[PDB]
Structures are given as structure tokens and as C-alpha cells.
Short mmCIF file of N, CA, C and O in Angstrom, two decimals:
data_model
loop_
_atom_site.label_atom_id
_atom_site.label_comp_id
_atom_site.label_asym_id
_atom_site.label_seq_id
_atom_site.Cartn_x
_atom_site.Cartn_y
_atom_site.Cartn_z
N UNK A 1 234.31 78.99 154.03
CA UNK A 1 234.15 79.24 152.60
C UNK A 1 233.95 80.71 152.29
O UNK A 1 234.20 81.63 153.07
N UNK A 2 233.55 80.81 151.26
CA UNK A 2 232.81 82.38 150.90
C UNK A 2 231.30 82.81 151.25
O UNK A 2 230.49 82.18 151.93
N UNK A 3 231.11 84.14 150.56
CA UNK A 3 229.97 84.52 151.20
C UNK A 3 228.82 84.04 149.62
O UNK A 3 228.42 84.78 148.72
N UNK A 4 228.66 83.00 149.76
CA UNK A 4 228.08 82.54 148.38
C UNK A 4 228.17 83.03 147.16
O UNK A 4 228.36 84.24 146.99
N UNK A 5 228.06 82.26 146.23
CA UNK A 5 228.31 83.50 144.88
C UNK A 5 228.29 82.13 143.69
O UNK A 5 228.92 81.07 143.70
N UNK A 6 227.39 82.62 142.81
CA UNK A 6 227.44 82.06 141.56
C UNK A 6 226.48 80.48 142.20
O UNK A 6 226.63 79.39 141.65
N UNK A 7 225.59 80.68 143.36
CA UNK A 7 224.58 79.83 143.42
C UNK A 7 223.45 79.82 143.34
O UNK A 7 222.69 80.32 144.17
N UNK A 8 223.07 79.14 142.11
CA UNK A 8 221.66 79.27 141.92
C UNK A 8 221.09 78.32 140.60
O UNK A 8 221.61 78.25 139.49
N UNK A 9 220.03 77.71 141.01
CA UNK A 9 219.95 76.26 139.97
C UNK A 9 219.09 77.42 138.74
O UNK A 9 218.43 78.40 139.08
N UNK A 10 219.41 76.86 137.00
CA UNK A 10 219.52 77.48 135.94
C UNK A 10 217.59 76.52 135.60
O UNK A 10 216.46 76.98 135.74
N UNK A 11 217.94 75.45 135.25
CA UNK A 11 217.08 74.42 134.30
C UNK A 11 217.21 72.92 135.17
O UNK A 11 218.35 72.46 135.16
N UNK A 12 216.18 72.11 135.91
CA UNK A 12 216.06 71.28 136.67
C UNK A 12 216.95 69.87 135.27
O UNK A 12 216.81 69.54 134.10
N UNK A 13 217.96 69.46 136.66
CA UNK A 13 219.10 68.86 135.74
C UNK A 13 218.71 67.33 135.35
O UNK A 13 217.93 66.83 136.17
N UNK A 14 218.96 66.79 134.68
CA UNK A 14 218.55 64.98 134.26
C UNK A 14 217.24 65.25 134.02
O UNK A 14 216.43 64.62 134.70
N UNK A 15 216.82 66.04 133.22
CA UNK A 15 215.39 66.22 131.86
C UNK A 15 214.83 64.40 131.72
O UNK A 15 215.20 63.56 130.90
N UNK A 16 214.20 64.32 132.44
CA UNK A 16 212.92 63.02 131.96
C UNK A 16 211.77 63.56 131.33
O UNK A 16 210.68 63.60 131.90
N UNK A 17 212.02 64.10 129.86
CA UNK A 17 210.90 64.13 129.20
C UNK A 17 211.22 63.32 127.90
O UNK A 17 212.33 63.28 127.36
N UNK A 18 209.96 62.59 127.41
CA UNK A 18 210.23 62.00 126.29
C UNK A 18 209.97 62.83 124.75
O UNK A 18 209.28 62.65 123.75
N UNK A 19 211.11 63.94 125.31
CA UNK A 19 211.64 64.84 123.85
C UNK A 19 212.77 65.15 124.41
O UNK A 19 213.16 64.93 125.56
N UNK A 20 213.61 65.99 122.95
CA UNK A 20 214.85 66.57 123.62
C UNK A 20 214.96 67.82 122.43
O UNK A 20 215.15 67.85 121.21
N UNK A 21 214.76 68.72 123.40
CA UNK A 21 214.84 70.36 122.72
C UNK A 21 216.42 70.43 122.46
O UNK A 21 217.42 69.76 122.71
N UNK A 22 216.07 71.64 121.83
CA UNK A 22 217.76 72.12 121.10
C UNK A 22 218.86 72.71 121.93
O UNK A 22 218.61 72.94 123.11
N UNK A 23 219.82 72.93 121.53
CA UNK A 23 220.96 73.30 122.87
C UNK A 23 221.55 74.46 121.61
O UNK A 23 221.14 74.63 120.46
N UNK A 24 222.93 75.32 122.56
CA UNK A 24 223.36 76.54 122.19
C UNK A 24 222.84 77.47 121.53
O UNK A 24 223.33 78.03 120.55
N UNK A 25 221.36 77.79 122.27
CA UNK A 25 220.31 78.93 121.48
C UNK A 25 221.08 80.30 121.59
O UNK A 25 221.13 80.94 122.65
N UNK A 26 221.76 80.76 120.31
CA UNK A 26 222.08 82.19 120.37
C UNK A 26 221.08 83.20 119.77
O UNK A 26 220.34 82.84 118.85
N UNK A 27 221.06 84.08 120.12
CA UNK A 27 220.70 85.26 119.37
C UNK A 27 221.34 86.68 119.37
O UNK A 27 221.57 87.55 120.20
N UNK A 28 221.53 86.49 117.95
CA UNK A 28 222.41 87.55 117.15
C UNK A 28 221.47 88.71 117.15
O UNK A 28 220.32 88.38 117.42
N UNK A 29 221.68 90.10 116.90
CA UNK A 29 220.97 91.03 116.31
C UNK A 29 221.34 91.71 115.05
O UNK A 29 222.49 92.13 114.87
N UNK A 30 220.21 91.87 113.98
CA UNK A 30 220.95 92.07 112.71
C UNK A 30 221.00 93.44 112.87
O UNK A 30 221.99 94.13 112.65
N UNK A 31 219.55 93.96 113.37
CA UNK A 31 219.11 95.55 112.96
C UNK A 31 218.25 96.06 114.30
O UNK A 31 217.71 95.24 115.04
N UNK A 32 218.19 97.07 114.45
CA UNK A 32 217.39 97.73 115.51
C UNK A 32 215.91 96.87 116.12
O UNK A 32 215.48 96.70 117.26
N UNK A 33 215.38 96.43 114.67
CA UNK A 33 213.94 95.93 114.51
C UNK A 33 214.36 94.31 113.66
O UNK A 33 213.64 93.67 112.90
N UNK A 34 215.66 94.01 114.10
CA UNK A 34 216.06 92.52 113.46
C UNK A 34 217.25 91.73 114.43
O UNK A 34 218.31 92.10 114.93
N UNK A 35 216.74 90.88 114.40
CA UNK A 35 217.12 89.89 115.37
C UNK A 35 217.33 88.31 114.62
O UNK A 35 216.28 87.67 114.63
N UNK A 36 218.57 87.57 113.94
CA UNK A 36 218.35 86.46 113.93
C UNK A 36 218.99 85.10 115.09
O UNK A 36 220.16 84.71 115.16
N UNK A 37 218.20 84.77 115.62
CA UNK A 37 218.33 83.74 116.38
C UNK A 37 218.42 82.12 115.81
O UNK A 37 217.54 81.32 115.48
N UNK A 38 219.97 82.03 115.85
CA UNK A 38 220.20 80.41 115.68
C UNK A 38 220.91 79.91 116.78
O UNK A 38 221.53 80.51 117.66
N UNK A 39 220.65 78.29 116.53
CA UNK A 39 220.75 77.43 117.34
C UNK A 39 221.50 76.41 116.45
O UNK A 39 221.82 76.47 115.26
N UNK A 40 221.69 75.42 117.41
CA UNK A 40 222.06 73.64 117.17
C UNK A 40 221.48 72.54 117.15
O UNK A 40 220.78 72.65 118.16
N UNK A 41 221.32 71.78 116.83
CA UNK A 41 220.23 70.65 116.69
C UNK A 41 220.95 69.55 117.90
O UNK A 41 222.18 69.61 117.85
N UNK A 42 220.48 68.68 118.84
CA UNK A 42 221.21 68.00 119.76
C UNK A 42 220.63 66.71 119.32
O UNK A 42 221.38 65.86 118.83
N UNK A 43 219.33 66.50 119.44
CA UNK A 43 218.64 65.23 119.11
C UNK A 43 219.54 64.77 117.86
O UNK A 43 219.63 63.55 117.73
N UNK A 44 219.83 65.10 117.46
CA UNK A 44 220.29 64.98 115.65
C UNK A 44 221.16 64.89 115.48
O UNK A 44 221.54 65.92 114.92
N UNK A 45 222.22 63.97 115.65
CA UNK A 45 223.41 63.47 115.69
C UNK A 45 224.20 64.20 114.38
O UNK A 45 223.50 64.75 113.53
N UNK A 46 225.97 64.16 114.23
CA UNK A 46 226.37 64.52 112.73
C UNK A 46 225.73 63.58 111.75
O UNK A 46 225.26 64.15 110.77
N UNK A 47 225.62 62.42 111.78
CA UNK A 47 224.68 61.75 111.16
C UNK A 47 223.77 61.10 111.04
O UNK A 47 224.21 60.01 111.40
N UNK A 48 222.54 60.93 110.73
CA UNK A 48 221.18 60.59 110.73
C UNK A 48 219.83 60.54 110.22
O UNK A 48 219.21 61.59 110.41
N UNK A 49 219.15 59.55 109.59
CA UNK A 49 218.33 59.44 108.90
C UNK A 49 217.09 59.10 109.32
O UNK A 49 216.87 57.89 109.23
N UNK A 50 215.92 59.96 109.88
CA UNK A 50 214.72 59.37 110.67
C UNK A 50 213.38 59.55 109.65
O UNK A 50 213.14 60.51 108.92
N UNK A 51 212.62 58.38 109.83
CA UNK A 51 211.32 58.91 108.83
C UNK A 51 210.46 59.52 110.11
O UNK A 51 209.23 59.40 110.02
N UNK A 52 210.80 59.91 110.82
CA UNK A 52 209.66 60.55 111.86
C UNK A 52 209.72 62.45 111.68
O UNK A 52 210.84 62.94 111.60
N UNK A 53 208.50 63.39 111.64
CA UNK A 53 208.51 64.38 111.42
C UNK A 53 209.23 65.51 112.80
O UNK A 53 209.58 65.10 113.91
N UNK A 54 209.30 66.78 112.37
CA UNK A 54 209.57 67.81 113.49
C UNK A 54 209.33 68.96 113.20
O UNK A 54 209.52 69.30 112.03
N UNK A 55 208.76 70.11 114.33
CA UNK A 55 208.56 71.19 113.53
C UNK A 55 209.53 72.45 114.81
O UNK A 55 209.46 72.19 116.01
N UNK A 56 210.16 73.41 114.45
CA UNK A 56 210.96 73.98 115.68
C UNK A 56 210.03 75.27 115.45
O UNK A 56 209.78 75.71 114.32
N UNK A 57 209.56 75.82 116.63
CA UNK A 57 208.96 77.28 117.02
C UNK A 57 209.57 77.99 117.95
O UNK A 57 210.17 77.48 118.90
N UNK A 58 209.45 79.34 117.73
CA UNK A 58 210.53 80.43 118.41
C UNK A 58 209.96 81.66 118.90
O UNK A 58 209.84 82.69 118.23
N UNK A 59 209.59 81.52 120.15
CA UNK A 59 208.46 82.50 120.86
C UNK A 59 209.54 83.70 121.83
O UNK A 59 210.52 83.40 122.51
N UNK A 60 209.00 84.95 121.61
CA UNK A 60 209.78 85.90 122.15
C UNK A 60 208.82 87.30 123.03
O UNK A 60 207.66 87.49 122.68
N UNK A 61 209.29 87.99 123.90
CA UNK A 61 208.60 88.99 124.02
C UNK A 61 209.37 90.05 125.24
O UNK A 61 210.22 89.72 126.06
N UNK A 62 209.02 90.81 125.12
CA UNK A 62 209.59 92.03 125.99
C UNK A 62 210.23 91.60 126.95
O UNK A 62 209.56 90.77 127.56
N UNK A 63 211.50 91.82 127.52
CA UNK A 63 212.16 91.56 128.46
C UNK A 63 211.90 92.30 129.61
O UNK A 63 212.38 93.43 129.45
N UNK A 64 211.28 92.16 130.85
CA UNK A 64 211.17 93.27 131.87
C UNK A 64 209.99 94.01 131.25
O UNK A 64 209.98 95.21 130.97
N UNK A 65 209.13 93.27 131.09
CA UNK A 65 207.81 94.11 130.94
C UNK A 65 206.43 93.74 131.68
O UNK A 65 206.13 92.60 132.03
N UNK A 66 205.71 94.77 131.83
CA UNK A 66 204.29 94.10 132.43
C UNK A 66 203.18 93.96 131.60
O UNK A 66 202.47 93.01 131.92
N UNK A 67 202.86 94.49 130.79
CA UNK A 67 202.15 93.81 129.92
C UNK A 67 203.19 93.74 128.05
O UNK A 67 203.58 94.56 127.22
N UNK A 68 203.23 91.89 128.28
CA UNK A 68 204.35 91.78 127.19
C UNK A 68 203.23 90.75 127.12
O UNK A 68 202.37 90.42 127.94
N UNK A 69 203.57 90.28 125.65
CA UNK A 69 202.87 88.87 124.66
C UNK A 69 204.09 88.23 124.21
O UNK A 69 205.20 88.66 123.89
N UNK A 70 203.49 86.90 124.27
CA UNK A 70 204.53 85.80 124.31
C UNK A 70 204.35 85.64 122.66
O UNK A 70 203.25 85.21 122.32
N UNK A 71 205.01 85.84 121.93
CA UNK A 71 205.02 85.31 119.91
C UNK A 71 205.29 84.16 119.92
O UNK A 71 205.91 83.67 120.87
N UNK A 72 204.89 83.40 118.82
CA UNK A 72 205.52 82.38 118.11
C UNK A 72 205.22 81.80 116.86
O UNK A 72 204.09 81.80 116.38
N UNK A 73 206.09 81.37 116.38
CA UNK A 73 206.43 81.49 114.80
C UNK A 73 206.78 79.76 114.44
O UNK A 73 207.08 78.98 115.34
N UNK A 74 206.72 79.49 113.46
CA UNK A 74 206.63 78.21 112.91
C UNK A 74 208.45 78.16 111.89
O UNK A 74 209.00 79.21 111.56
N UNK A 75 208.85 77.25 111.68
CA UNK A 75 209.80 77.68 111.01
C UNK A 75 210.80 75.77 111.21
O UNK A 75 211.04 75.12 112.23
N UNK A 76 211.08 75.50 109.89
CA UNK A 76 211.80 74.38 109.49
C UNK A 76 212.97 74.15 109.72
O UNK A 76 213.38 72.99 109.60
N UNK A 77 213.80 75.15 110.10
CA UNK A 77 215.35 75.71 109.70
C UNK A 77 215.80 75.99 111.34
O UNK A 77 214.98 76.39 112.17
N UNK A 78 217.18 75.74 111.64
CA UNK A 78 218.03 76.32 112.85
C UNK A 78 217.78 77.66 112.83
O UNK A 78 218.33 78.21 113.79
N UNK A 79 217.36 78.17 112.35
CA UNK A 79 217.63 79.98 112.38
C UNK A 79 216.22 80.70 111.80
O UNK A 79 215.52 80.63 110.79
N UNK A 80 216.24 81.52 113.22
CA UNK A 80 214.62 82.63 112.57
C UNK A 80 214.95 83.80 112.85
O UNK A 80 215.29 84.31 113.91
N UNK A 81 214.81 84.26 111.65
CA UNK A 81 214.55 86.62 112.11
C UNK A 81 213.40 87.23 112.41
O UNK A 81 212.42 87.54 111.74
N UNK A 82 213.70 87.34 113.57
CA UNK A 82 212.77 88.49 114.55
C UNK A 82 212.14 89.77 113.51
O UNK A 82 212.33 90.90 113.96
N UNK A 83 211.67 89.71 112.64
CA UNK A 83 211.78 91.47 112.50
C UNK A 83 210.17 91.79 113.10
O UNK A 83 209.16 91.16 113.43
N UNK A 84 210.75 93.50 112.96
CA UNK A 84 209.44 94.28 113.86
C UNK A 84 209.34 94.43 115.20
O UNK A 84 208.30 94.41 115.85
N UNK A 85 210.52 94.58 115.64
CA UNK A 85 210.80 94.33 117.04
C UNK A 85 210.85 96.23 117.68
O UNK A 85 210.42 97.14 116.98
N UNK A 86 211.31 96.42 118.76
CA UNK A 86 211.65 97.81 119.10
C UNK A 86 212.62 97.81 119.28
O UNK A 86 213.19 96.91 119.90
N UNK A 87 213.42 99.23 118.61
CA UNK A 87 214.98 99.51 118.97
C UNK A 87 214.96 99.92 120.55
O UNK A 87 214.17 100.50 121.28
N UNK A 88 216.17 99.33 120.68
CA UNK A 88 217.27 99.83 122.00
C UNK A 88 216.59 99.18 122.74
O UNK A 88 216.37 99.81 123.76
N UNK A 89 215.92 97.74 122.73
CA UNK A 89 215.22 96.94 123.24
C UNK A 89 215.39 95.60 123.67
O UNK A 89 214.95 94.91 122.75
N UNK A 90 215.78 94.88 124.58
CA UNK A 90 216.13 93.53 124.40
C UNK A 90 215.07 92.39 124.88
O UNK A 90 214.46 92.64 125.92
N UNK A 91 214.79 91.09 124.17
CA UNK A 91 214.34 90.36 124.91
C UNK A 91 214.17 88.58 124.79
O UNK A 91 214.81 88.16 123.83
N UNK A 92 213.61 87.72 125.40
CA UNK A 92 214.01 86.59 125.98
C UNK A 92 213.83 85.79 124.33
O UNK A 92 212.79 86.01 123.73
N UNK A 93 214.83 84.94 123.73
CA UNK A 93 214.11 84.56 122.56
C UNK A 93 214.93 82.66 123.54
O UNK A 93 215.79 82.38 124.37
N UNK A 94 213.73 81.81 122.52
CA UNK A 94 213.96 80.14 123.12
C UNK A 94 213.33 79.56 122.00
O UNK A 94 212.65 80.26 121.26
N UNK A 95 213.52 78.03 121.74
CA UNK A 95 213.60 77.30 120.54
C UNK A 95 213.29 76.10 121.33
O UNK A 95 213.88 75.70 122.34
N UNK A 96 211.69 75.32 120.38
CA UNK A 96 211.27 73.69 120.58
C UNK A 96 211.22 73.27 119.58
O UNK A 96 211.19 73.93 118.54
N UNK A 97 211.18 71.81 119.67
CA UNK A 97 210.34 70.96 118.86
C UNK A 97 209.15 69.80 119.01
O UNK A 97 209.01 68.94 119.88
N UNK A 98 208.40 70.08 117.91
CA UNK A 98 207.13 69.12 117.86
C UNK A 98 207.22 67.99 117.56
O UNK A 98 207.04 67.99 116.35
N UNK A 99 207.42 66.68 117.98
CA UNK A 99 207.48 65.65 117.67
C UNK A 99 206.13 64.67 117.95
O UNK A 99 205.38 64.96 118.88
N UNK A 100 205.92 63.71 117.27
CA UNK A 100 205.13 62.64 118.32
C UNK A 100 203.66 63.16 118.24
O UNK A 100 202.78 62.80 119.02
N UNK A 101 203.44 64.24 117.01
CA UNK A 101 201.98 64.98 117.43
C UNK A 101 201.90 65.53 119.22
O UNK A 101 200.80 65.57 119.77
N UNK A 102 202.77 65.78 119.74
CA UNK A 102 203.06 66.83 120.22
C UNK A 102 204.37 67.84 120.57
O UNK A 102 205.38 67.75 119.87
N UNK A 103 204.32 68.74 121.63
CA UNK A 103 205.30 69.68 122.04
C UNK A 103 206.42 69.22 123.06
O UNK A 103 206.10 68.39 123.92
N UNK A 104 207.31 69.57 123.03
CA UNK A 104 208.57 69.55 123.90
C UNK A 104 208.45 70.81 124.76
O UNK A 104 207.39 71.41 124.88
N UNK A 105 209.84 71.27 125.50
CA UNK A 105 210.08 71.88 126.60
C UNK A 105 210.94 72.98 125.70
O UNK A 105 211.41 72.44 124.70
N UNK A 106 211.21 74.22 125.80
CA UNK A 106 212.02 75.14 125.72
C UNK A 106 213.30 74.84 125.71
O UNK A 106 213.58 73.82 126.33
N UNK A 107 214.57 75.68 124.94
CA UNK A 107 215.56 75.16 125.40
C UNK A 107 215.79 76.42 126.15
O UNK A 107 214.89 77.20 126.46
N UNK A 108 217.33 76.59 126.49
CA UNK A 108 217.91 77.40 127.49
C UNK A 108 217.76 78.80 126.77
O UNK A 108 218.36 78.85 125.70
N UNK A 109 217.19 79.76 127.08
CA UNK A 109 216.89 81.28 126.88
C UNK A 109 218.10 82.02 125.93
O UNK A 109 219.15 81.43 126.21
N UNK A 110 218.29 82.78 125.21
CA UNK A 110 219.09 84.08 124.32
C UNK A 110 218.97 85.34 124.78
O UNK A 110 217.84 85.83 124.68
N UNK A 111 219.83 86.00 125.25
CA UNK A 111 219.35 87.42 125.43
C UNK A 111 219.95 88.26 124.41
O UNK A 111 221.09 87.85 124.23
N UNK A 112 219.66 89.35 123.57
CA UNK A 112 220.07 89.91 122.61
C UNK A 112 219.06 91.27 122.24
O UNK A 112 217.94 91.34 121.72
N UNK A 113 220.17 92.52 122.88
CA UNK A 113 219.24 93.79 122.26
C UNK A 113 219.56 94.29 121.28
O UNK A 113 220.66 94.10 120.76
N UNK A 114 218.64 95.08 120.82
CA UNK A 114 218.34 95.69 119.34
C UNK A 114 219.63 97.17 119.49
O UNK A 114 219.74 97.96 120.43
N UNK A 115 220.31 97.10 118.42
CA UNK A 115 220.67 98.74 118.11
C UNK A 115 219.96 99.91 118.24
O UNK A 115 218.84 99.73 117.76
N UNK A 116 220.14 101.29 118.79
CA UNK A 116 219.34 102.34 118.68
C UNK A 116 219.28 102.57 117.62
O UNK A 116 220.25 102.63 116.87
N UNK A 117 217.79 102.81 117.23
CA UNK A 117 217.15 103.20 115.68
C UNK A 117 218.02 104.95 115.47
O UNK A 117 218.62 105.67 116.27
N UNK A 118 217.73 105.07 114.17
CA UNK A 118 217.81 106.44 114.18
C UNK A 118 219.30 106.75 114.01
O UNK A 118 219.79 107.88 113.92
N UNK A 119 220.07 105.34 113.98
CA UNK A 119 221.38 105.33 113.36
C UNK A 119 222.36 104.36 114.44
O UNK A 119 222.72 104.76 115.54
N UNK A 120 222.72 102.99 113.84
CA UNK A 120 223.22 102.17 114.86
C UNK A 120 224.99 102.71 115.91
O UNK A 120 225.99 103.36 115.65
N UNK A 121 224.58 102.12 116.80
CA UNK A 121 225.67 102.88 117.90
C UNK A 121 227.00 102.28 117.21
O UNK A 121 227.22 101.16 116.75
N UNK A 122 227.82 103.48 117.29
CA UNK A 122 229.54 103.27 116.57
C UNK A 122 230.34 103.45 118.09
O UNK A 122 230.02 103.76 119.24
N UNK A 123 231.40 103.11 117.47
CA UNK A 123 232.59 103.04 118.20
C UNK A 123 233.26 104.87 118.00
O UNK A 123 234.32 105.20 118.53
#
């Protein structure tokens, strides 16, 4: 064969938890110090009507840092903006939900850096 390549397990596969976090977490960057990060809803079929509640939170912090703080933010909607962030900066943003009076698992990570402040990079 080859000399290995492209092996290495991502997220432990067949999830037995009784939740199911969100899938295709992107994150966009708007501005140096803005970042909006959306996603997809998976639990949530094209159609569906549940009387049970949910709440999605979106925790982020320095990529490659040693002393970094983990954020998180409350928010109803597929999509949250980062602002107040540092230019020319990138780092890990991920999306749950609260169901059941409690928490779920993370979904799969976003990586997305900020423009240099001080005037965004051109072509």
C-alpha cells in the first residue's frame, strides 16, 4: 500500500446519545472583529411539528492558544455573530442543543479567520 495518509478518526462514529446536535457548522467571517456562524438543523426534518422545547449555544475561543476562554452565547436561530473578536485571528466555533432540561454534544468544529484590521486584505 502507501505510506499512510489521510488516517485518522475525526468524531467517534454511531453517536449513542439520546440527543442529536446539528450538522454542516460553517463559519463565515463578516469583519475583522465579525464572524457569522451558520449551520443546519438535522434533528428537524423539512417538515415538522414538535411541542417539545430547544435552545442552540455557540461557544468559541482562540485557536492555538494557552491561555484562551471557552464563550458561549444563547441564541434561537441557525446563525450567530461573533463580534469583538481579534483581527487576523482565527478560531474553533461549534453549535448544541438543549433538549430534555438538558445538554447535547457539540457538533463538528468551523474554522474561520478574521480579516486584518486596519483595512481588509484585497486582491
Amino acid at each position: 500500500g502507501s505510506s499512510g495518509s489521510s488516517g485518522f478518526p475525526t468524531s467517534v462514529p454511531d453517536l449513542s446519545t439520546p440527543m442529536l446536535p446539528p450538522v454542516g457548522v460553517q463559519a463565515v467571517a463578516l469583519t475583522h472583529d465579525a464572524v457569522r456562524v451558520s449551520w443546519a438543523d438535522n434533528s428537524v426534518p423539512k417538515n415538522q411539528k414538535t411541542s417539545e422545547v430547544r435552545l442552540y449555544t455557540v461557544r468559541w475561543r482562540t485557536s492555538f492558544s494557552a491561555s484562551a476562554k471557552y464563550k458561549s452565547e444563547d441564541t434561537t436561530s441557525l446563525s450567530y455573530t461573533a463580534t469583538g473578536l481579534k483581527p487576523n485571528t482565527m478560531y474553533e466555533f461549534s453549535v448544541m442543543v438543549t433538549k430534555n432540561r438538558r445538554s447535547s454534544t457539540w457538533s463538528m468544529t468551523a474554522h474561520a479567520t478574521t480579516y486584518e484590521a486596519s483595512g481588509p486584505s484585497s486582491g
